[PDB]
Symmetry: C2
Subunit: 368 residues, 2 copies
């Protein structure tokens, strides 16, 4: 009767029932149990070419916390990151005792602007604790400059929360990265299991450390010898994870289809000619359809107009982090571009089961 | 063949499959979904006489973190707690930016000694940020004096991680407490579902706030207005929790029976006469069987002796927190009793399915 923003569809119980019965037989239910290891092994084989290492975590927000806590420089104070990201990103930083320092984004790709970033690193020197870029909207943010940062001794944790399963040229996003990449398996993201996350790194020793950190910093004596907490993923989450890997081809194909319908219908209804624009990026996997509305149109009015037509759009990210109550006083560079994107950005609905006619009803409402 | 220390048995899949069908039909998988709400309502009615409020969390460690972060006095530096606790407790404080300050325990009930705690509150004054007692080994640590601290403006968050389901005179442990109580649903704890936890308070508004904190500090506009992170429990975890509520009488009966057998066999084999002693408490629900070995016996000799008889005991908590690498340099009162109890404490196996003949094996081995 209406078009909601979110309609999650995780794999149904029949797809992971075998695994539930293995769990019941084994009487191991969490703490890096066999199903969790099998899930990690499957991911390393199917996505990461058996190079590097992964660990599951209970959610991507805990993964950011763990990665930042492990990798931050001891004497640093700031986590250099975009304001144009989900609040989880600066929150993970603050829980690690760091202050966010917001960096402006490019107007076209919506990633942190590397020119500004480099300049800020040069200026802050030892005050830089860590650099936390966001691979905006599950897209192909090239990591070449970030890999260079790691090699110069500036640690990098990439927030790719919504980008798991993003492939380009047959390579999975993040492959062989020196730093850490965090992905989310939240039910609302494309690889959605309910609650869950993953960390990848080419650095196997670092992944081994995060595994400890996720288990109270325990050594092999179950003695706490390093910072830690609990971010263990249960066997039950790993079970849905594994079943999701096996239906993933279908899901990726669904999203890709709906994405192409959006691009076609937008173009065919001449919305691009009216000044709507898509993100500039090589490759993306879409949680929703992000688009800039025309310069002369206020994005909150789009939301309101669509809401009259029974369609729920949203405004990721407006307010951006620097404009939100909690983060409004943290330092930043000039953020003119962020501010502009935050006035224009719209988030259009996209979920499994969406038909071409639904996309068309949305695209036509945009235009009228 | 070998008697292992832990042998978790969560309710089997058939017991929550209906709920899994509900989840699949609803397409709501997390973020305080209807099954999670049902679970919490079932707890409020079933355990807390519909007075106060609860929230699920992804695990008790994160619940501790949320609770301390909300309730800590903003000018304070220290979290006053026992050393004789699981490392999750001081780790939770350290993540909130506090230093643990360790307080000695009573030699008999093994709780934080209130006399020593009071003197220390009086000495530290504004430097006290929070008090975090542990209801050692799932027992009935009376909360009258802690309620008193709350009334005086000293915040208390009680770590009762292993004590969910603990009843005494028909009242659930923590009922009507003004502060917060954290409980765990880890698979190894008596009310075990995999990964999970719960927070109870008589203070409903505080619980509402914790809810927001565990969803990124979001208000109804999904804007971040307070410190927060992700500690949301999935619908799937709630599904198992609900099923665990229906079988809880069975689980509790099984554990009480095994405890009773332990007590009878220990007395009948003369072990009490030989200097072995149990916790002085009115009521306990048991994850394992804690016992002090005789003064002249080293508890770790008891471990190595049971070990070569195919029985895995452990030593919770030896080393105590103050003795573990990460926490050695935090301040404390004199800890003479904690040290003594950490030289004598032994953790004997107890799990669902343990037979009377298995307890007898064990108790007989203690007797030599
Ligand atoms: Ca199968
Ligand atoms: Ca049923
Ligand atoms: Ca039924």
């Amino acid at each position: 009767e209406n078009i909601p923003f979110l309609r999650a569809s995780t794999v149904p119980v029949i797809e992971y029932l075998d695994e539930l019965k293995e769990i019941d037989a084994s009487h191991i239910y969490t703490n890096y149990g066999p199903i969790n290891q099998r899930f990690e092994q499957t991911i390393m084989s199917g996505f990461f070419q058996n190079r590097g290492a992964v660990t599951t975590v209970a959610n991507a927000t805990l993964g950011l916390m763990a990665a930042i806590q492990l990798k931050k420089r001891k004497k640093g104070k700031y986590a250099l990151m975009p304001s144009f990201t989900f609040p989880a990103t600066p929150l993970a930083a603050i829980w690690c005792g760091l202050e966010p320092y917001f960096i402006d984004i490019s107007i076209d790709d919506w990633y942190m602007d590397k020119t500004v970033l480099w300049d800020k690193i040069e200026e802050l020197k030892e005050e830089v604790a860590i650099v936390v870029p966001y691979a905006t909207f599950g897209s192909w943010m090239n990591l070449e400059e970030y890999e260079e940062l790691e090699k110069k001794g500036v640690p990098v944790v990439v927030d790719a929360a919504p980008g798991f399963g993003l492939m380009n040229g047959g390579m999975h996003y993040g492959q062989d990265f020196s730093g850490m990449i965090i992905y989310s398996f939240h039910a609302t993201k494309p690889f959605g299991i309910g609650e869950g996350g993953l960390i990848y790194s080419k650095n196997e020793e670092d992944i081994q450390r995060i595994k400890r950190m996720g288990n109270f910093g325990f050594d092999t004596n179950r003695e706490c010898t390093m910072m830690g907490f609990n971010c263990k993923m249960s066997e039950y989450a790993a079970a849905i994870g594994i079943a999701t890997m096996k239906k993933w081809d279908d899901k990726l194909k669904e999203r890709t289809r709906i994405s192409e319908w959006y691009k076609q219908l937008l173009q065919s209804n001449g919305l691009m000619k009216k000044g709507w624009q898509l993100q500039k990026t090589e490759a993306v996997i879409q949680q929703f359809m992000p688009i800039l509305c025309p310069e002369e149109v206020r994005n909150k009015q789009v939301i309101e107009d669509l809401k009259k037509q029974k369609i729920e759009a949203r405004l990721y990210f407006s307010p951006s982090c620097h404009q939100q109550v909690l983060f409004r006083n943290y330092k930043s560079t000039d953020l003119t571009r962020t501010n502009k994107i935050a006035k224009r950005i719209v988030s259009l609905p996209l979920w499994e089961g969406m038909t071409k006619e639904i996309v068309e009803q949305i695209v036509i409402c945009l235009g009228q």
